[PDB]
Amino acid sequence: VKKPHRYRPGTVALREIRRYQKSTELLIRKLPFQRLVREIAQDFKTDLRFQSSAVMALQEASEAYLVALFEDTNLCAIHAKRVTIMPKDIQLARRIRGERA
Amino acid sequence: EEEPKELLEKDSKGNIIKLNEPSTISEDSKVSVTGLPLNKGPSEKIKRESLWNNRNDLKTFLTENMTEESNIRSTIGWNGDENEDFCSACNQSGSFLCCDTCPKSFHFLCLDPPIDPNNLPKGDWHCNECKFKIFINNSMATLKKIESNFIKQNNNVKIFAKLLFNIDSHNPKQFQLPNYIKETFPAVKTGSRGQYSDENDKIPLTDRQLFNTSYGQSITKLDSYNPDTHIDSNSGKFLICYKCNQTRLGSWSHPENSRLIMTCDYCQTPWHLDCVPRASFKNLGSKWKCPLHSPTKVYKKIVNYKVWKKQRLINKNQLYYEPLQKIGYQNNGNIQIIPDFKITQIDENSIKYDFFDKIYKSKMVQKRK
Amino acid sequence: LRDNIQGITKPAIRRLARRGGVKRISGLIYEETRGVLKVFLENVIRDAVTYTEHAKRKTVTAMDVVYALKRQGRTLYGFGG
Amino acid sequence: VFFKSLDHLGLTFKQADKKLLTTKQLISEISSIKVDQTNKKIHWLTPKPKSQLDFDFPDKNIFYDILCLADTFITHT
DNA sequence: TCTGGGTGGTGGCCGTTTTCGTTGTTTTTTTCTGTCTCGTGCCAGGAGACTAGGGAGTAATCCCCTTGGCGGTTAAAACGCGGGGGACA
DNA sequence: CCCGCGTTTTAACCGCCAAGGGGATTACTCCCTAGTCTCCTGGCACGAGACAGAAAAAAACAACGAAAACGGCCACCACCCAGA
């Protein structure tokens, strides 16, 4: 007899888009990314140490690359008359960029 | 790759004068040591991490010459005198006789008739469904010509005709109560694979609560005075045990004076492990019940092993028909204290009078003897 | 260290997509993004560790990462160089 | 690693000291002994207890060691 | 005996297979021509032998900061329910 | 199927403490590289010759598109069985 205030799907998504394009703080949590970086590095040399600045630089580079990739992915998804990005969109973006063979 | 030569390598007439030992190479560098291969010393890494930065006295070879072959006692031999990973029938895991045709999979003891694992029919085995598929050809007219004939030939039990008919087309299925009977008892609840549980079964612990708890946590409320938090969490007061009537925690400077305490799973009454004689916290299995609750099974000997069980809790079908009280009114044992599975409603004073006259009239009966 | 790629949670990828201007995200996108991120990190950390080894160091410095990114064509400002 | 392995109650120590050697825990112990006495007051003799701890000092010459350690710390801080 | 349902046979329509001719392309033998490969001769860059200097290897010291761990707070991640708008046929 | 909202759980984050590996630097010393003169032989330019390949014409064959035949599905008629 009242109904809660549910925003129509796609509204909070746009609000989040605005919020996260307005800000600059890193979006990936720091500890999980550091653990991932160390695990990946473990396959090239054992008993490696990382300067905190090194992990931060890796995180910034990775986040910037992923954001640019998602921009290209959204462009491809819109090109297909879609609104949802799908793995095929990421694959096409990477293929055109020249990253994926 | 040199051929796997048969070592004997007979030369002239089976004299085997010349041999050819197999190449080892393998079973060597096998790296199956719990470290690195058995023929190699500790690794440089292990060395760096691990280091700190009289044979004439061996009275072992002198054992064969003082060991006497012993044969006493009986010693006479005492001669004399692609495919599914879960069983489609019981919905569980195990060895499976996967169907060549159907994607379903069954246990060996869940088929019909049960099949011995070492005595398989082998070849190709079909499930009941695919056997019916090939026996029916999937068209409806032939299936009609078959099933109507079946019904006609089963006129004696025509009332059950189609029930009989449809069994042949069904794969074996484990029996489980339909939900319309379990629901009658809110307490009961199915388990992960059909482990049929009640209110008396403790909620299972997670791997985080057992395999990740650090030194002094989990079942480990037996290793340190660290769990001094046997203080009433909600109120911050001291959980007092019902028997000794005090809480013992001593101090961090006298942890030996602390006495373990636990709270009953049913009614949160604290008890000392040393007051209800116990050796551990439950933490697992079933829910602990005080010695302060009423029995459910009341096994009685008068052998006359007459059983009494308290009727299982019924859905709110449940009836409470009010007494007119006083003596008599023999309920079985079911009661609902008040200020066809009919939970009788005995209030307070009726119990007093009933016990009073029970013990008194029993004493007068003893007088009669 | 095992199964840390899942540390890049679904909401983190959602935030990254939102910063990229994405309004609706398919369910399969998260695993693909994790794979792409793993490939990128493997390509970068390989060169970073190569630089570290050449310097005969046991510590990967931020300047090694910066050199690796510059080598790959992703010059990064704000960490020296 | 050997002597450490046999150090069960000592490896958790230095972290249990931080928690259990504090104001809250120290008042908790004394209050609990008082509560036990008051419960054997509810369910046993009412009047009798006039203490809850019995710290004893059989040996002098330890006070001077405590004072020496305190003096060393003070001089270091 | 008549009507309805189901099965069997015959006819019609649709789909698939083949069946055929037609271009387009590939393969094969002959021709011939111009660039690849080899040789000759000269020269200038590489080699050899030697001296001088300092860049870097190596040992020693030290002081940062990278690692580890531990506890408390709570923000974020997870899991679930529900619905509608978007994918897609 | 994915967004949105809500409990519920997890662990990230902070901060604080303890330890030491390894980055960073300094001093010593030598072995490696630059430099230079003399020697010469490998590499380059030029000339040549001939055979690998381009071309080409002709035949073989190997992908593209129509009517008949076979098979499958649907409709209609005939026969048999069941019901009225």
Ligand SMILES: [Zn+2]
């Ligand atoms: Zn089964």
Ligand SMILES: [Zn+2]
């Ligand atoms: Zn089957």
Ligand SMILES: [Zn+2]
């Ligand atoms: Zn209880």
Ligand SMILES: [Zn+2]
């Ligand atoms: Zn007790």
